[PDB]
């Protein structure tokens, strides 16, 4: 679990969005596993606007932060789950690191701010949904 809070927006994994997120929907994209909902309270997370390929992510299944080197956002094949059929997920960045399904939502950050959130994983792999291209999150 986990979300990004910026301006009057809440960014979460689409597969973990609540009834309240859908009732206050701003934008969603199944191909990216992202959903954005509106908030009444102001948020203070900063979104990175950069091309960093290194950062630190929060891993809730270990209660720890780990440094990672990750690939540039791309279309990556993701096996079927209870949430989606087998498909290419877009804007996904992979790295070597520990992740379990419940780790989705953990923030990936570089020195410029929030890069994305955990969205996929594998055996010794962790995948992050990029949010740096969503320029409208800042206006
Ligand atoms: C952090 O997630 C995992 C971590 C580890 C593994 S495993 C035990 O196969 O190594 C599997 C996963 N599960 C995972 O990638 N997804 C399930 C939830 C929806 C995700 C999506 N964006 O399509 C896909
Ligand atoms: Zn950066």
Best CA proximity match to 100, nearest among 59, 68, 66, 71: 59
**What resolution (Å)?**
1.6
Question: Which tokens in the block code for residue 81?
Answer: 């789950």
Coil, strand or helix at 83: coil
Structure determination method:
X-ray
Catalytic, out of 21, 33, 103, 130: 33
Q: How far apart are CA 13 and CA 16, in angstroms?
A: 5
Ligand 2: centre distance to CA 51 (Å): 6
Ligand 1: centre distance to CA 81 (Å): 8
Specify whether 60 is located in the same domain as 84: yes
Dihedral (Cα; 102, 14, 9, 133), 10-degree rounding: 100
Question: Which tokens in the block code for residue 64?
Answer: 């720890």
Specify whether 37 is located in the same domain as 49: no
Is any ligand 1 atom within 6 A of the Cβ of residue 37?
no
Termini Cα distance of the chain? 26
The sign one gets for the Cα dihedral 52, 107, 72, 123 is: positive
Phi, psi of 101 (to 5 degrees): -50, -40
Q: How far apart are CA 137 and CA 80, in angstroms?
A: 30
Q: How far apart are CA 47 and CA 112, in angstroms?
A: 7
Coil, strand or helix at 1: coil
Specify whether 15 is located in the same domain as 54: no
Domain that holds residue 130: 45-139
Supply the residue whose CA is at minimum distance from atom 21 of ligand 1: 120
Coil, strand or helix at 15: helix
Give the number of whichever ligand sits closest to the CA of residue 114: 2
Is any ligand 1 atom within 6 A of the Cβ of residue 100?
yes
**Number of domains present in the structure of the chain:** 2
* Annotation says 15 is catalytic: yes
* Annotation says 65 is catalytic: no
């Amino acid at each position: 679990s986990g979300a990004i809070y910026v301006g009057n927006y809440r960014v979460v994994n689409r597969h973990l969005a609540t009834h309240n997120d859908w009732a206050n929907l701003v934008w969603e994209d199944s191909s990216r596993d992202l959903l954005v909902s509106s908030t009444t309270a102001q948020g203070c997370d900063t979104i990175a606007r950069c091309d960093c390929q290194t950062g630190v992510y929060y891993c809730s299944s270990r209660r720890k932060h780990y440094p990672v080197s990750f690939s540039k956002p791309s279309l990556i094949f993701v096996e079927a789950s209870e949430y989606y059929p087998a498909r290419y997920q877009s804007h996904l960045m992979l790295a070597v690191g520990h992740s379990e399904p419940g780790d989705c939502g953990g923030i990936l950050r570089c020195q410029h701010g929030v890069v994305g959130i955990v969205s996929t994983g594998g055996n010794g792999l962790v995948g992050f949904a990029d949010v740096r291209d969503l320029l409208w999150l800042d206006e």
